[model samples]
Target: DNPYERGPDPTEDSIEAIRGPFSVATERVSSFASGFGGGTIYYPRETDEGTFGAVAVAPGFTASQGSMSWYGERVASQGFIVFTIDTNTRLDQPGQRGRQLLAALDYLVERSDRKVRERLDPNRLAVMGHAMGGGGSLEATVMRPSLKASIPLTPWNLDKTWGQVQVPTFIIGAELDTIAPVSTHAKPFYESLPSSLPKAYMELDGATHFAPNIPNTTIAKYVISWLKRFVDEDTRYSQFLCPNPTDRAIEEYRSTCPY
Candidate 1:
């Protein structure tokens, strides 16, 4: 039995819902924090589910935490701590964003208030970001191989090769994205990842680079599944991942299944 499993038996409707079984609460962090600019933390309101895994999300270059704020409660309600952070500067590059993601996690573990620290499972953590921030998610995994999962949405990175990443990574690309086009960014990063590593790539149909900035059901379902599978080691969520989802919003999907 999976002790980490915190939600009800899985169903498409359950996973696709805007909110999950847990009620969510949020805490705002200060920009004066060390290592990262500062951000918001979203956690389940109840403690009965036991400590939950956590994820740190970053927005792309020239963007703020607001761009990635929607993910806070959406993912946190599904039974994990979600930190959507602001970078030191709006112009910080991918590498800088990656470090900030890690710093945010450290703050949650060591410096955050009782609300977040009390609910976090330090060993089970993940990273996610959009655009260059997505690139940072990849970099964060490499820097901290202990990360449970990584999701880079419409990522942008000059260094295509990610053979060093050890986490189960899920890359979401926008089919029509011009800023961080899949052809040069997301696809290459996915391909460069070691084939032995559990990895997947999904391209959003007729979407733009900014698609992830808004709420999207397709993104929510798969992201929840990935975090559940890898972070919680709850295989119950695997059914939604394998066979490569065929959602109409998805232009294409690829992965090393049975993970």
Candidate 2:
């Protein structure tokens, strides 16, 4: 049985939390010297000053950059380097899917000469995804333990196996999701990770597999809070991380609390 517990507050998880006043910009990396081809990279335009943590977000199968852009834009808006990537092929193998994200980490550093890329912080790197992409996010962490964090959205890798993942992670699941039900996809995956690692899972009440894509502020609040708390290692975001526990606004919440 699971051990951690949590409840919430009205402002515990809101889109307006952690307003960085961060500006953003984006570019096509398909032709960016082939470190990792075919991706739409979103980056920060301004920040309080310091290299910002970076991340790569892969779309679910049959999904593309446009589908993942909402995440890319918002994370970047919070003062981090975010890339909404494109796989070499829509049905790309899982190993390749994992490596693509691994490569983007160095790719972001390689282009440090560019504008937002200059603010890129290699020390606090992460990767995220939707479905199959979410599977890859976990795989990437296993393949590269150097990753600081991983967040999978209603992930769908019923290959459901990760006995050795030490990376910090956050998972968002959907209550009504038939595609990647919480019982199978989210719950098991989150529970399977090494207990020594800090992790959290938030269940969106009436969502489908595309939980993060839903029109809700609560989703961004959790994502940003986790990223800020873990990636940026900022304590100011701690309030949202531990919360007063999850309020009525959120359906369910669990964590190995990073606060």
Candidate 3:
């Protein structure tokens, strides 16, 4: 049976996060050597009472933090800390890109100063990315399975033998994406993943390769809900996650949760 795992953030707080009504704060860094690449860091204006989880995001091929910063801003508005990173190498392969995201996440807890570090919850973390970087999110799962969750948006990875992936993974693909069409890239990767793995895939009906080039409100809703469900271990988000009601933008939705 599906039950609340009860971790750091409570159900109500996770629910509030999905609504994203809070004011957000941001910090743009020039560089962080040992940590990871440079990008924007977005977080909630308030962090005194509760410790929110974290997510590190990487951009697609030939893309930078500027293109993906909206996700950082959007997710941060919901209470979690988000780092939208630029890869040391824009053309990094899946595994290397995964390391890039992981390094940024590690820096938050292990390299930050006291004031910045204290506000973080060391045990809660996730990773996300777009296109090639989307593939990297799954690679990060293989590199570090401890991540609470992983979200890959229109991922483009040829290496479909990700059956070893163990993280709770939520994949979003574009129905009209020619680059990583659902038939070859997304579906194969999703299907090849271990059956025991908790996973979900959503195809946006009329979207293209650049589906997430800008912020889409529907994407925001599901992204936050997935983060809350696995990262916060709050079962309240199951409502937002399943029951598979029809929505125009969502072309296909398949998921099994509470893993």
Candidate 4:
């Protein structure tokens, strides 16, 4: 029997429990550093399943952990562990944001009770973020070569050094984002990633920076498809990640660039 199973809470609605070939577990970590906050975790519940891979996410400026809860929940429900770090720091320095994300990774690897250190597939781990957090995510990837994949959604500024990213990368952009113009941010950044690695650049036409944050079913579909293709090694979802010429009409904006 799964040690993590629990009866539905009486206060909440009678929502169906998640059923899957893999088990699910929920956890959290609090930072010891002053002004540094903690993060939440969602992972496969079974230990025999091996080390659990994870996605570390950072939310955009002016947004709190609440903004990323949907993403965390969605990815967790899919199978891989998800970590959503709180970047609402007391200090004003922005560079420290990436470091905080790394701290969250350390927290997971060092967990004494969870055995996550042994179970996680280190090479399959990924980092993702939105807007300002997207910029931070890129910085984190550059800071840590051990990360296997990255996804930046409508990032604010394109770090020319993004070419340093050697792992597979997915950069998502909103065509209508005036705050973080695609021309300057996403397009240039996508161009910067190395041509050798698996790279994809997508423009969500008619989408704004806020479109990803909303609780839309489409987001779940895309997120699941992306994670399955890149992290879970699900070839079935490859079309969503790398759609062919015949599939262009329905997937153009969502399609991955050849790069």
Candidate 5:
């Protein structure tokens, strides 16, 4: 089943209602292979800051770009261009799907009409993916020589290539994802990485594979905070990314006893 078809159409008004005040643009790209076409949405803030930075997202196997709309919008509203690319193909091949995301980035850079180029400081960019998309994001990160950062959200184990990641990385996983269990999937990947590159791993409590993009304000706020800190160079948002244990207890864990 096509996950994209399962969700509602993603539009500016729909996103605005859920995450307000952002301009949204969508594009459809045709590929040589039949049924390989995909769509991307660029959600940006109203200000003419050009394009401060961009966040490229790849969905899990058979998942649609629509499933990641909330994440895209949340990142965009925090002052960067957010792109969610569709990567459904014959099989869940990371190499081929990862290339598609690179193509999407090239398309964005080469577009003459987009005013974002002027505002793109460092032209700094990050790519993130979920499940199969996470594998693709990792593959794409290594294939291309220039990405500043990469985030793999609950990626399937790709142990052989984990050591190849030289760029900054943020790996996020749910504590209870049985399909891509953190102990088997994320921890191994994290442990295998070389110590030279900066890395951060986050374990979101009570989150599952499908739960990350749900329309929860608390989750959305955390995503926005990550982008602001990393892409926008705003350290003020760091607390959200790595909150104090007390703050976590009060805000998220809700434990009465002090840590």
Candidate 6:
């Protein structure tokens, strides 16, 4: 049995739901955080499942934590700790956002309140971000190779070559994204990662750069599955990641499956 696994057995309907089986609780982290502007921590309410893996989420340049707010409870309810954070400055670049994501994870493991600290499994942490923040998720993987997974939602970064990233990465791109066009940003980043790396690129058809900012079942289901597969090492979720989803929301899907 996988000791890291949490939650019950999975199914397509369960993983695709807006929220998972676990009840959620929240705590607020103040803006005076150590290295990043503080935001919110959403965690599963049950402690009996053992410590849950955690993911730290960062917002894009000029975007607030509110823009990524939907991921907090939505993901946490599925059986993990979700930290949606604000960068030290709204205009901080992806590199800065990457460092801030690490800072947020440190905060979760070492300084967050008892509720959050008690629920997190420090070793199984991951990172995510939107737009430039998504770029930060890629940067974070390069800086911290031990991370279990990375989800860069329509990410934008000037430094696109991610050949050194060892984490299982899922890059989501918006088909209509003029800000960070898929051809230039997402596809290149996905292709640049070592072909041996567990990586995938997903393009949202008829979607804009801001598609990740809203509540879409397509993004939620895959993000949850990626975290579950990589962070928790739960193969029950593997069915969702492998074979590449053919949902209507996806214009194209690519992956290094059987992961």
Model 1 lDDT per residue over 1-259, tens place: 8889998887999888888999999888885566877788999988987999999999663343442488888899999999988754347688888999999999988888898899999999999998878999999998999999999989988999999889999999999999999999999999999999989999999999989878899999999999999999999999999979999999999999868
Cα lDDT over the full model 6: 0.88
| Per-candidate local distance difference test | 0.89, 0.71, 0.76, 0.61, 0.57, 0.88
Clashes of each: 0, 5, 0, 5, 0, 0
What is candidate 5's TM-score against the reference? Answer: 0.72
> What lDDT tens digits, residue by residue, belong to model 5 across residues 1-259?
3211111333323333454455554443444323223545464535543446676777764343332455665556546666676655346666665676676666556641345544444456777777766766778778884786677777765553478787666676777788778788876777666666556566677778765545655445544544554555555544444532232412222111110
Instruction: Name the weakest run of 10 consecutive residues (lDDT summed) in model 6.
Output: 59-68
- TM-scores of all models? 0.96, 0.84, 0.87, 0.76, 0.72, 0.95
- For model 4, residues 1-259, the per-residue Cα lDDT tens digits are 4222222221111111233245556666664633236666767666653455678777664354442366676666556778876655333232466666666666666652345555566566777777776776677788887776677777765365577887667777877888778889877888877777777766765778776666544444555556655666555555555553232211234233432
- 42-93 per-residue lDDT for model 6 (tens digits): 9999998799999999855334344238898889998999999875434768
In candidate 2, what are the lDDT values of residues 161-208, reduced to their tens digit?
676988888888888989778899888998888777788888887777
For model 1, what is the error of residue 140's alpha carbon versus the real structure, in angstroms, after optimal superposition? 0.4
Candidate with the greatest lDDT versus the true structure: 1
lDDT of 3 by residue, 1-259 (tens): 3332323333434443433655677676555644455666777666554777889988773343342467877787666788887753346677777888898888877875454466678788999988888888999999999999999889888798788888999899999999879889888888888888878888999999888767787677788878877887766677777765256889998776544
Model 6 spans with C-alpha error above 4 angstroms: 61-68, 87-90
lDDT of 2: 0.71
Considering summed lDDT, which 10 consecutive residues are worst modelled in model 2?
Answer: 1-10
Off by over 4 Å in 2: 1-20, 32-37, 61-68, 87-93, 243-245
